[PDB]
Amino acid sequence: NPTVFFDIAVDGEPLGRVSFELFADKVPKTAENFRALSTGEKGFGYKGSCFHRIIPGFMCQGGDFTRHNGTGGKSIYGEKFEDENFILKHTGPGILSMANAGPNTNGSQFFICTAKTEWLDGKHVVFGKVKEGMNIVEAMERFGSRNGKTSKKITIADCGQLE
Amino acid sequence: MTEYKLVVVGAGGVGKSALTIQLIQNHFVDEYDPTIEDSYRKQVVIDGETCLLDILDTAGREEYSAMRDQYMRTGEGFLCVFAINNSKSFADINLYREQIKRVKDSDDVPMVLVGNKCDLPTRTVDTKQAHELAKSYGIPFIETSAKTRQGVEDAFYTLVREIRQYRMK
Ligand SMILES: CCn1c(-c2cc(N3CCN(C)CC3)cnc2[C@H](C)OC)c2c3cc(ccc31)-c1csc(n1)C[C@H](NC(=O)[C@H]1C[C@@H]1C)C(=O)N1CCC[C@H](N1)C(=O)OCC(C)(C)C2
Ligand SMILES: Nc1nc2c(ncn2[C@@H]2O[C@H](COP(=O)(O)OP(=O)(O)NP(=O)(O)O)[C@@H](O)[C@H]2O)c(=O)[nH]1
Ligand SMILES: [Mg+2]
Do A146 and B37 touch (CB under 8 A)? Predict the structure, then answer.
């Protein structure tokens, strides 16, 4: 399974690095999308994008690199792609899962759980987990709010694939 | 200055946010941007009196219907929105009205029925059906387009008038 990293910044100041294991062995198409978006190798991707919705107690959501407002993003396969499978569940903090607009509408937006969110099981494709830097994700929560609006700009200052 | 707590409810995608953003920000964005929840404040003049509107824009998500009760308790009047091209959203109106009635323990709750998206040519809910539903509730019915602004101020101001009449008693 490949590993990718995000270097997180808060209003342009470094916070730290989060790395993720991507479950290519169970969800290869979905893992590959996130991997390629993390490297930028298709000519577009996560670098420079923000976490537009942070709700403490639930999750941190980001991945809109096209409109930068929470409505955009695109996959490496087209605007949207189908739900690969729902094998993996939202079991607790650190789970990495796809945002969507309903069935079969995966793009680039994703979320990192900060708690168990079992009512999302079967609706969002889980495809990875935080490997290192969960402390960083925990630290991001204070910049969110009940409706998710952030009080500082939380950005992916850099991202890529690790050896 | 009198404050009015308005809550905009209805099925997902009917245009609750588009209506609210038109009122607050005077523009329309043609994007899929589902709401979590948002609160807005706006001062207006209605029938010659300064009113302060506190507007809660809510998510239309059946999977979170239990989360509605808390804001139904606090809200003073409800804009109940359906889309004129979505017959399911028109049926869903009754679920919201029943929930408001049960949470607030009253048949007298200020409400306005709003049929949105009246700029679209292909209508599936006829005005006769909507008028008869509003009449059966004893509440006003207003047709709107958040896209063109048609009826938008009328919908919110009519709801304030319903609250104002309720408070007179
Ligand atoms: C009722 C209030 N509410 C609530 C809610 C729910 C609870 N509980 C439910 C579970 N029980 C057991 C306990 C109580 C408590 N407190 C609140 C909030 C804090 O009260 C304000 C949620 C929510 C989600 C949406 C709308 C309203 C909503 C929504 C609106 S778009 C959406 N979901 C799905 C979202 N697609 C997009 O962004 C699309 C546009 C892009 C392309 C999406 O893929 N993801 C990823 C997964 C998480 C989801 N976003 C999201 O943000 O979930 C927020 C969360 C707080 C987890 C749930
Ligand atoms: N043609 C037209 N489209 C409209 C109108 N009002 C909203 N829309 C469109 O319908 C879609 C849903 O609108 P939106 O206001 O986000 O709906 P909502 O009721 O707030 N949805 P949610 O409950 O998920 O927050 C958007 O694409 C929006 O541009 C309208 O009056 N006319
Ligand atoms: Mg909305």
Answer: yes
